[PDB]
Design an enzyme around this catalytic site. Sequence first.
Site, PDB file in Angstrom:
ATOM      1  N   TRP A 107       3.651  -0.728   2.972  1.00 46.97           N
ATOM      2  CA  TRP A 107       3.009   0.529   3.328  1.00 46.97           C
ATOM      3  C   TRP A 107       3.780   1.293   4.439  1.00 46.97           C
ATOM      4  CZ3 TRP A 107      -0.861   3.399   1.224  1.00 46.97           C
ATOM      5  CH2 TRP A 107      -1.629   2.823   0.199  1.00 46.97           C
ATOM      6  N   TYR A 158      -8.172   2.489   1.279  1.00 46.26           N
ATOM      7  CA  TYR A 158      -9.048   1.494   0.608  1.00 46.26           C
ATOM      8  C   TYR A 158      -9.953   0.736   1.551  1.00 46.26           C
ATOM      9  CZ  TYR A 158      -5.479   2.436  -2.941  1.00 46.26           C
ATOM     10  OH  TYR A 158      -4.614   3.041  -3.832  1.00 46.26           O
ATOM     11  N   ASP A 173       2.185   3.231 -10.976  1.00 44.62           N
ATOM     12  CA  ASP A 173       3.659   3.067 -10.852  1.00 44.62           C
ATOM     13  C   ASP A 173       3.969   1.793 -11.658  1.00 44.62           C
ATOM     14  OD1 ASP A 173       6.268   2.187  -9.978  1.00 44.62           O
ATOM     15  OD2 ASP A 173       5.958   2.929  -7.934  1.00 44.62           O
ATOM     16  N   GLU A 230      -2.000  -7.824   1.817  1.00 40.98           N
ATOM     17  CA  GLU A 230      -2.530  -6.485   1.531  1.00 40.98           C
ATOM     18  C   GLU A 230      -4.026  -6.522   1.154  1.00 40.98           C
ATOM     19  OE1 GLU A 230      -1.799  -4.509  -2.133  1.00 40.98           O
ATOM     20  OE2 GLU A 230      -1.271  -2.610  -1.188  1.00 40.98           O
ATOM     21  N   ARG A 249      -6.002   5.876 -11.357  1.00 45.68           N
ATOM     22  CA  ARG A 249      -5.691   7.263 -11.726  1.00 45.68           C
ATOM     23  C   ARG A 249      -4.190   7.472 -11.883  1.00 45.68           C
ATOM     24  NH1 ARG A 249      -3.191  10.172  -7.765  1.00 45.68           N
ATOM     25  NH2 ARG A 249      -3.221   8.966  -5.831  1.00 45.68           N
ATOM     26  N   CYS A 264      -4.701   5.300  -5.471  1.00 48.25           N
ATOM     27  CA  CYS A 264      -4.065   5.129  -6.789  1.00 48.25           C
ATOM     28  C   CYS A 264      -4.965   4.252  -7.646  1.00 48.25           C
ATOM     29  CB  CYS A 264      -2.637   4.573  -6.637  1.00 48.25           C
ATOM     30  SG  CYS A 264      -1.574   5.777  -5.870  1.00 48.25           S
TER      31      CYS A 264
HETATM   32  N1  FFO Z   1       5.513   5.043  -5.450  1.00 48.83           N
HETATM   33  C1  FFO Z   1       4.440   4.299  -5.127  1.00 48.83           C
HETATM   34  N2  FFO Z   1       3.801   4.558  -3.971  1.00 48.83           N
HETATM   35  C2  FFO Z   1       2.713   3.862  -3.600  1.00 48.83           C
HETATM   36  C3  FFO Z   1       2.227   2.771  -4.476  1.00 48.83           C
HETATM   37  C4  FFO Z   1       2.989   2.509  -5.723  1.00 48.83           C
HETATM   38  O1  FFO Z   1       2.618   1.586  -6.501  1.00 48.83           O
HETATM   39  N3  FFO Z   1       4.060   3.307  -5.981  1.00 48.83           N
HETATM   40  N4  FFO Z   1       1.165   1.919  -4.102  1.00 48.83           N
HETATM   41  C5  FFO Z   1       0.043   1.885  -4.963  1.00 48.83           C
HETATM   42  O2  FFO Z   1      -0.617   0.851  -4.977  1.00 48.83           O
HETATM   43  C6  FFO Z   1       0.925   1.867  -2.640  1.00 48.83           C
HETATM   44  C7  FFO Z   1       2.016   0.963  -2.007  1.00 48.83           C
HETATM   45  N5  FFO Z   1       2.296  -0.256  -2.781  1.00 48.83           N
HETATM   46  C8  FFO Z   1       3.531  -0.799  -2.939  1.00 48.83           C
HETATM   47  C9  FFO Z   1       3.675  -1.941  -3.740  1.00 48.83           C
HETATM   48  C10 FFO Z   1       4.951  -2.503  -3.910  1.00 48.83           C
HETATM   49  C11 FFO Z   1       6.079  -1.918  -3.309  1.00 48.83           C
HETATM   50  C12 FFO Z   1       7.464  -2.523  -3.451  1.00 48.83           C
HETATM   51  O3  FFO Z   1       8.420  -1.885  -3.047  1.00 48.83           O
HETATM   52  N6  FFO Z   1       7.644  -3.736  -3.975  1.00 48.83           N
HETATM   53  C13 FFO Z   1       8.976  -4.317  -4.201  1.00 48.83           C
HETATM   54  C14 FFO Z   1       9.568  -5.032  -2.991  1.00 48.83           C
HETATM   55  C15 FFO Z   1       8.574  -6.038  -2.411  1.00 48.83           C
HETATM   56  C16 FFO Z   1       9.134  -6.633  -1.134  1.00 48.83           C
HETATM   57  O4  FFO Z   1       9.837  -7.671  -1.185  1.00 48.83           O
HETATM   58  O5  FFO Z   1       8.848  -6.055  -0.062  1.00 48.83           O
HETATM   59  C17 FFO Z   1       8.983  -5.269  -5.372  1.00 48.83           C
HETATM   60  O6  FFO Z   1       7.909  -5.604  -5.864  1.00 48.83           O
HETATM   61  O7  FFO Z   1      10.051  -5.648  -5.864  1.00 48.83           O
HETATM   62  C18 FFO Z   1       5.919  -0.775  -2.501  1.00 48.83           C
HETATM   63  C19 FFO Z   1       4.656  -0.217  -2.322  1.00 48.83           C
HETATM   64  C20 FFO Z   1       0.969   3.253  -1.983  1.00 48.83           C
HETATM   65  N7  FFO Z   1       2.073   4.100  -2.436  1.00 48.83           N
END
Ligand code: FFO
Lengths: 315, 292
Positions: A81, A145, A220, A59, A217, A197
């Site tokens: 994403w 970004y 999560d 990323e 801003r 974000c």
């Molecule tokens: N709700 C939400 N949307 C967002 C963000 C966020 O932090 N929360 N992000 C803002 O930056 C971006 C996306 N970043 C993300 C970061 C981690 C994961 C996630 O699901 N991680 C899981 C599984 C990882 C895997 O194995 O694929 C984990 O960490 O357990 C998803 C989106 C854009 N939209």
Amino acid sequence: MEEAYLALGKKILEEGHFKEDRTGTGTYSLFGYQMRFDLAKGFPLLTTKRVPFGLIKSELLWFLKGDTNIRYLLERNNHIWDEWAFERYVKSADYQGPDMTDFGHRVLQDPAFAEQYKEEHQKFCDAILNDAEFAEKYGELGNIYGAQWRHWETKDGSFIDQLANVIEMIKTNPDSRRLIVSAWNPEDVPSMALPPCHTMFQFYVNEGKLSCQLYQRSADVFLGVPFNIASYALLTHLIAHETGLEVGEFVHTLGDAHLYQNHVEQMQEQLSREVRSFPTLVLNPDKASVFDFDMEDIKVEGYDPHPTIKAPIAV
Amino acid sequence: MEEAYLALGKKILEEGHFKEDRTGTGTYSLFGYQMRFDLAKGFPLLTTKRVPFGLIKSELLWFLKGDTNIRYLLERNNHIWDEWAFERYVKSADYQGEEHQKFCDAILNDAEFAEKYGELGNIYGAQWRHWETKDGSFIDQLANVIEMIKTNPDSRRLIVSAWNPEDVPSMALPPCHTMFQFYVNEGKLSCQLYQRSADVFLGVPFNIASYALLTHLIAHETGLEVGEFVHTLGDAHLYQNHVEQMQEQLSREVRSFPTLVLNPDKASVFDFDMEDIKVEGYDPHPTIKAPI
Ligand SMILES: Nc1nc2c(c(=O)[nH]1)N(C=O)[C@@H](CNc1ccc(C(=O)N[C@@H](CCC(=O)O)C(=O)O)cc1)CN2
């Protein structure tokens, strides 16, 4: 320290008021927070749950090359994403599968629907990977970004490479109070798949150490912040490498810090676990510029986390 | 709390990093700091020294209406933006070598001269209300954020940026107040400012009252009560010749913050003027003078 991150989760569980949100998920939330990580004490990849560094690396590298299409991520098996791109696709005139309205909530509630979404999402990833016309149209997230860091578009037909400019200013003007990169471009925000974000960041240099402060801003706390912390810690290390500096502190400043309500058991489980030593970042000494690094040039060593804690992403 | 501002001054004295810039100016600084002011506890105009509120409010009012011409400030005896206007004028064509007063009078008593010489460029008024786009139209960030607060208070996007990398390398004074964000919960409005650069002794007290007042004005315009102003700093520096002033201030007992009073009989803050904003029970220790 990891402790500073865990104290944030705990404070939100305890006193974070309920807030409706854009995603329809519902959150508990606080406003205004600051965490500091001394990068000399180890690389801040959380140990109380397994955080996948390969995703964080791919990323960042995607950001650094100025790319805003998800194809590059998919080629490296990074699907973080996907939902926002798929969302644009399913709302378009070209989508002809089963109804995907509100897919983000419906997969959690309805297993026959979960299976349809998995089928449609598979076909979408396949088409992005293999069909370049499809990738070009549907992999695009707008000027997020990557675009603002490398290619902030000017009023007179050009672009500013903000991030490369900040790196150069650190070398020759380290005491500048303007070592800033902003992804908040009011003109491009409406056509961004999401506004940034992690919104703006600033560098500072003292006695040969490079520090970085991020203004975020919207945070999560369970799913995103662990990625964000490691991402900016990695960036600070890359820039310190290029500029011949040591690493100082990463300072993480938050606006709306939120725990999604369907992350509460996960955060509680995380809080029951003893902290372990942070790992160590290893960077290829032969790479000169931040923009020369590829996946093999960056690793983490001595990473021994507690198990993965699964949680659903809010779309 | 005022204690939070004093704690910053104390920490900078005790452990700030010394730096000397290209011209001999010394500072003690730290990087990354955050203070919170619960606006229900009172209006954060510092009590450990007199901070003049007149200048804060005519300045803030000037930004809020998006005015970039100094005429509005002169009418109200605010002179803090006078140099980058008088400097411009004496280098122009129509000037012949107190003369400051002749310039100040013409700005006030001659419309065309005001447009020609009272216009500042790309400063807060313009960034907040009139942000230029590629095709030549403008985004009014502040008005948009106000409507979002009324119609979508849960929004995590209530952001006003003052930072355009296209324009920064070119400007005399790139904005110290880089961006800010609003937040609404339980009928209360809060504001966080990100400030890239903070003169701790002289600037920060002005900056606190300015953003606290802004939060109150937006709360008033939106039918909300006040929550907190959260002040986040990047490079926070105490000038070396402000050290004795900071130590004197730290020796003084904190008093209760005053109460801000806004004209209730007036609905929109875009019709606010000097007499619509009052401070009651301000009882500070004496003015502490410092080289600028
Ligand atoms: N709700 C939400 N949307 C967002 C963000 C966020 O932090 N929360 N992000 C803002 O930056 C971006 C996306 N970043 C993300 C970061 C981690 C994961 C996630 O699901 N991680 C899981 C599984 C990882 C895997 O194995 O694929 C984990 O960490 O357990 C998803 C989106 C854009 N939209």
